[PDB]
Design a binder for this molecule. Structure first.
Ligand code: ADE
Ligand code: ADE
Lengths: 258, 258
């Protein structure tokens, strides 16, 4: 599986931009672009040899961790830190079988009893996304927490919080240019801040937006989608046009019509 | 007023393309582009010095005629052939006054008792658009008929038919890339053929399409517009997206929203 490397040590908006750009490039084949927006591979008929990409992250403390992303939805399915590998609870047999192909070389493979959706993760972390700061500093720390979990060094709530940080700075940033932009700003000014409503609503709406665009009438949505602005004010989306500069990738929902 | 020249003598799809391209360039200022489609100047506040463009047409018989197009809608308002000038009946005082600024140098200025809309013109011609052949040959002939009207040489029905030809090959071709394309084909293969339903429906719908696009919700139409394909089958338009490659210019209907 392809491996993309990134280090928080000395990261700049350019090193981070290049990274996210490399991830998107691995995620999509370029064979399916809907209204100028690339669509991720369809899970049906996809060979395991092309099902995952690995993201090796290192930090200033020289600790390294490798995350596995599923190509069909850009989800982090598990990670590896030295000796051991940890996987979120699979939500079906196809997926349970697919992950058996990852980190086959580790001596200790563990599968959590919980899945990786935000609801579960926030419960375990004891904090919501709106309260967890994002930025290069939080990421640097997340890499170490993830690493120390394999040594009994990290607490369950810290592990959960770390995943929340990693998932938004890697998977969500790859999905939305908007979110990647929010991250670039934090890195540029060395700011560490929790995500605003615009970010959280987009994260929550990815699956629906992907469906609405793919089932739209020449780009026109059958029913509008309510999003939130940074100030929290609601904002209705009626067309794929205003989303072209916001969403970078879509999950496959249906075949394109003639 | 700017003058654009075109000759049917030895015309090629390239000489015709350059011509239509020059007309569009005179018609629009470039200050108003709605969803990638240029909008014509608003009639309110437009100075007479920038209200018209002239199109001088010549043919193989060496006859010349000059048509006046109104910049706000690309309409042919009248023409000049040597000694005399003829104007369609103005449909308001603003317009009656504006045309007093055209062909001020002719010795004989006449204003028809009828206007230039297709309904009136088809009645006078004794034939509908669907029955009047378009092409370089029909245009070559139209220029002569228009010219001979000033000498008592052209019959009223032939004059009307000639205008119908001129209006579709100049004004409608400038408004729609689709119609300009239909004309290029006729010229390329030296074909002379009446317009199909796709052409006529577009001509009929220009004002509505301009309004629907300008009042759309992020490109999404509030109510769909029914057009016809070349084979006559109906086809619904729900978004401005599929029209971007079809319509070249829009008439000003409203100011653009923030
Ligand atoms: N583990 C995960 N990977 C990607 N997107 C997610 N959204 C919530 N959990 C996720
Ligand atoms: N005289 C004219 N000029 C432009 N478009 C027209 N449509 C009908 N009559 C017209």
């Amino acid at each position: 599986y392809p491996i993309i490397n990134f280090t928080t040590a000395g990261a700049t908006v350019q090193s981070y931009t290049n990274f996210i750009r490399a991830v998107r490039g691995r995620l999509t084949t370029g064979a399916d672009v809907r209204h100028e927006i690339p669509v991720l591979p369809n899970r049906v008929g996809l060979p395991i040899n092309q099902r995952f990409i690995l993201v090796e992250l290192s930090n200033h403390a020289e600790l390294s961790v490798t995350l596995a992303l599923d190509v069909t939805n850009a989800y982090v399915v598990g990670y590896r830190a030295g000796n051991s590998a940890y996987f979120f609870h699979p939500d079906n047999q196809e997926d349970a079988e697919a992950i058996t192909h990852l980190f086959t070389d580790v001596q200790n493979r563990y599968t959590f009893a919980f899945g990786g959706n935000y609801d579960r993760l926030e419960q375990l972390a004891g904090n919501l996304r709106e309260n967890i700061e994002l930025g290069n500093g939080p990421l640097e720390e997340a890499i170490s927490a993830l690493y120390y979990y394999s040594t009994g060094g990290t607490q369950l709530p810290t592990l959960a919080r770390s995943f929340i940080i990693c998932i938004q700075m890697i998977s969500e940033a790859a999905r939305f240019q908007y979110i990647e932009g929010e991250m670039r700003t934090r890195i540029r000014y060395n700011r560490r801040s929790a995500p605003d409503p615009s970010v959280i609503t987009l994260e929550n709406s990815w699956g629906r937006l992907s469906t609405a665009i793919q089932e739209s009438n020449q780009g026109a949505f059958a029913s509008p989608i309510q999003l939130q602005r940074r100030n929290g004010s609601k904002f209705s989306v009626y067309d794929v046009s205003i989303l072209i500069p916001i969403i970078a990738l879509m999950v496959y929902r249906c075949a394109p019509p003639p």
